[PDB]
Structure 1
């Protein structure tokens, strides 16, 4: 018992910058700082933007602010706290059945607005700042207009699908692939986030 370890916090290590005319990834913390911050849960870096790049000791993925909550996938974060300026912050939402977790959005972050357009022309934002057109095919699936190897999508769970007007439509959860080629993506619809918030 005396030697049982604690898991680290999720740490924000960068962002996908969507503020201008060009989407691009920025790193804000390197590996040594990430490891230290995961242990203390104390991250004094300034946070900006809607889409964060996040890491644990073993994985890296995305997290997206919508309605004042920073959302990501359970299969990346588990039940972990997130690092913040005053120490670890406990999840305010956890739903393994939806593959969804959320923490209060970091000070400095900006939130996407939930889409009410009812549009099926979507855009997936990856951890490499690719903006991939996706045609909505149901409540929680969309097809890639141009299929890609799953290598391209790995590490982007937790990122957003957006409508033409830049509203949040969903959170990327899983790739639908055959022979290593992603033809479609599954996502957690924003309506499901809004229900979880109640």
Structure 2
């Protein structure tokens, strides 16, 4: 395959609770995609041009625990379901796609890379439907073009009877539009 991924855990349940409370995370950061957790749920952030982007429905208005204490969001767009923190030192920052490809790859929290065909500005179909359970906890994950650049971040699954056949996503252009208006 072209694009491949693996994950590495860094913190367990106890570490997560404490870190949530102190807002201070001293762990080394690495990787293009951060696996995030609050008290109640898990999701992903994709690092694009120095900013960690994720979904508002996961992060709300919360700070991100960091090496110098809590990191305030620098972009918050409720209607777009989009938030961003400045990326901590160590994060591998990706580049937006400029090739316009409609052949996408979605990266899940399990580090699977799955084929998506773009069907609209914010919608792609899954070439092979999956149980929605497989996609839970993956909101905020990148949709990449064949060159591995960011087209968008995964927002919600379009499902029938617990089966996801398509995904709604936030185009990498919305990130731009949010940063302008700010």
Structure 2 length as normaliser, TM-score?
A: 0.96
Of the three residues 167, 171, 175, the one matched with 1:185 is 167
**After superposition, what is the alpha-carbon deviation per residue over 1:2-35, rounded to whole angstroms, capped at 9, x for unaligned?**
xxxxxxxxxxxxxxxxxx9852221011111111
Distance 1:21 1:139 in 2: 22
Report the counterpart of residue 87 of structure 2 in structure 1.
Answer: 105
**Is 2:92 aligned against 1:131?**
no
**Is 2:32 aligned against 1:50?**
yes
**Is 2:123 aligned against 1:147?**
no
Report the counterpart of residue 159 of structure 1 in structure 2.
Answer: 141
Residues 77 and 21 of structure 1, relative CA distance in 2, 3 Å threshold: closer
Deviation beyond 6 Å, 4+ runs, structure 1: none
Name the SS for the 2:168 alignment partner: strand
Residues 21 and 144 of structure 1, relative CA distance in 2, 3 Å threshold: closer
**Is 2:3 aligned against 1:26?**
no
Distance 1:85 1:25 in 2: 21
Q: What runs of 5+ residues in structure 1 fail to find an aligned partner?
A: 1-19
How far did 1:67 drift?
1.1
**Structure with the larger RCO, 1 or 2 (CA within 8 Å, 6+ apart):** 2
RMSD: 1.2
Q: What runs of 5+ residues in structure 2 fail to find an aligned partner?
A: none
Structure 1 length as normaliser, TM-score?
A: 0.88
**After superposition, what is the alpha-carbon deviation per residue over 1:14-62, rounded to whole angstroms, capped at 9, x for unaligned?**
xxxxxx9852221011111111110000000000011010000111111
Report the counterpart of residue 122 of structure 1 in structure 2.
Answer: 104
Paired positions, count: 179
